[PDB]
């Protein structure tokens, strides 16, 4: 089984002004991550990919392009989760047939599902696809907060490999490491990569790695090497850039910094604001000069 | 235009064990609401309809059947919102062509959309379809809370008629009545019908009206006539029933209650637990006996 | 025991520039309430009285003054709750000795107390004083939310008379009226008096009744007769006033509105901002001319 | 100026059955911390000391005893915060008079104070005592969250030394280190010591150091030496112990664990449940056996 540890960018997608996928740009974002950011893999179709604003056919298109462009150069995880479990199975099977290395699914959201319902959800996607599974936990958007005993129940299925922890509860993260030492953890908060790596997370899945991939690998590797002082300096610089990106508008600022690298990262998909304002373009240029030149 | 005030059932949908729509059963639920519950209209494709777990074609299928079964006997409101704005627009056009009386859309969820983007979403649906719109507010599931000034901005669009207020903030409720006297308000919390009718809401859109339509009508009409002691008594009985329904499982218990009236309400759609347990079936029968016999 | 239903002003207290109690001003506030606002009673030492920023001796002084000035003109409730249960008991005994008609106690705060702990706290204050008790709900300032079954457990003590309900949950409100018909409810949200009265609350305890008692009484009395539209016109004006009071700073604005009636309501007690700026004073003068002249 | 970095136990207080202070037991808790736990200091009068359920004279007693028993053997911080700002100044001056090294104050709670009000509160305690101050973050009990800009304003006063950070926001933690490099940060989450130490916190104030002082020092210093794998092993044993402590009831379990060391840590002060049950006692003895023997 292809190794899933390390540094994975959460793949941003380039959209045309009309909301349709810009394939040429998306291939450029992919090439930049693989060739310039030097990531170990791509995490395709997650919240960062503007996934939940798209139809099933568009989701399939993005998975088709990403796999054809990356080929076997890097590891690929397919995020196929959704409120629609039939859609999730459908998408899981499609990515599996394409050769994705592993599936991932957000906890079903909107409705307040019970834990058994969440569990059936994960077990079904695995049983209908035959693929391995990474629980995608992002409580800030889902409102789903699972405790240590519930992760143990999910882990009864041997195809559940671990969790993409897009949450800042570092006690729970240590508890997960203690209770399930053979299960993987990927940090989801780029601006807290140092403290997550201090507790032994196995990798990181991040939206800022599309542009800050060099620094993110250094933080990860220096921290695992016991060079905390060195990692902290690079996490400080990284956070000045992340703070700017958050203040200027996460999605649009990453796409604008990508455009400054010559990648046609396009526009955001509506209902997200699709076009950067003047001021937003100005700020991106400034972040570029200060932190990525 | 068709009158949109009064008592509206939020239509539940009958599903087969495999998750496909049971058309025959759905037509039975529809007839029950019109013929026995004596509703003024149906609210199709809401949360209650298990709408966010379905594919776009399934949503069009439910809209088609509901319109074909109901024809022009009662008022029909089509809930077409989603995280996908292109899908909302598609569904909005579809229901418009079918002849629904007005559309409605949940505030875009999952991503934390800004107010301007939420207003754009509503204005886009309106521009693309040409239909009137009822803002669908359900903070408990969406996490979106809008204050009085934001409602005013949404109301600058003359096609916005008002709001389905599925929240229990009665100060905000009075503020809306005070500030926008020409805009309608439909109460969305069945167990708080009396206090909402004491502030003059124009109607009620509710899931328990599928089985407790006679009492709901009474509470609403008795409150408007100033008969608060008589209304409260019926609200008390109604809330014993709702407390039982909520304790036993809202979706499955309304469905099991419909089955005791000989309506083939079927199962719930996965990720929701699809079949009721033996305890759930027994509790429904006991509620049937106690409150709807 | 004395009748405790009706309109109760949550007594505000007059402080000097240095934070000490201004007795003459406090007596003027009491007199304005009894003689002009025509209240049924006063609720003394509650949050509105700036009670939790004071020492025990100050709370005792306020109790002494208020009983001395009101004599037996109106009903008097004494809020004696605290995080210190020994202080609660001392204050409960003191107000009992003075002739307060009943006590009240906020749910113990700061620490996260269990329900058995909260119930023991109320049972102890009652046992050590021999007085009747009004329990709370106020979750906005305590973060303590109790359910129907927890109120039942508190109501096993025959000296608990009911609850001061300062939380907007009208479902819980109707459930309390259903299960405990002989237990009293006082609404604590002045901007939601109408809908609370619509469900038969027995009275209301509010901070705005120190200046708007006339209207508060009308809303209550009109709602009770089923004259909803007339009550609502008075609730609408009342909420324009309240909206203005809330935006300008609640405590200082009610005190500035009292000063415009010739009542020396003085300053607020630090940590709260003690002095109203020039813009706050002007806004209160405007509110007085528009709504209280 | 005495060095305030390192390991501080948040001092538990021994109470008699009647809620009064057990002086003899309190001196024994102090002696165990200093001589066996080998702390660098004690944090006296904080939430862990049950301070908020006590009278002003009891707080004073505890400061007197603590200083008399510890003398100048270790650093001593006095927590003097309260909803009552006059009480905060009185305690601040008393502890300054006793020769405490630095003061601390929780953010004023119960009412929702504004930032200027909180800053005024801190600036008043400092002006009135002449002592240094450690501010708080602590959102779980107070509900007050503050950002870099506001810490900036607090830090304009040169007598503010830094912050006792008791909520786990590691992004805010790094940003604080970045913006204000010379300002100190004491971690307040014993179960997240490792990640806090990886970001360079200056020390830790913890309730569990009263019994697990030795492992707390090792985590802190190994982490600072970049020996993360060894650090993590001790954090994992520590967290098994804290998980057990938390499940059994924090305050009572640390006191029963001290009793097993020959310390008369006595009872909790009402409203907290004052005496441990047979099951709580037995679980403490089991935790002692597995983790502290």
Curated annotation (Swiss-Prot), chains A, B, C, D:
Cellular component GO terms, alphabetical: cytosol
Record-listed aceneuramate binding positions: 47-48, 166, 188, 190-191, 207
EC numbers, comma separated: 4.1.3.3
Claim: Cytoplasm is one of the keywords in the record: yes
Catalyzed reactions per annotation: aceneuramate = aldehydo-N-acetyl-D-mannosamine + pyruvate
Role according to the record: Catalyzes the reversible aldol cleavage of N-acetylneuraminic acid (sialic acid; Neu5Ac) to form pyruvate and N-acetylmannosamine (ManNAc) via a Schiff base intermediate.
Entry protein name: N-acetylneuraminate lyase
Species per Swiss-Prot/TrEMBL record: Haemophilus influenzae (strain ATCC 51907 / DSM 11121 / KW20 / Rd)
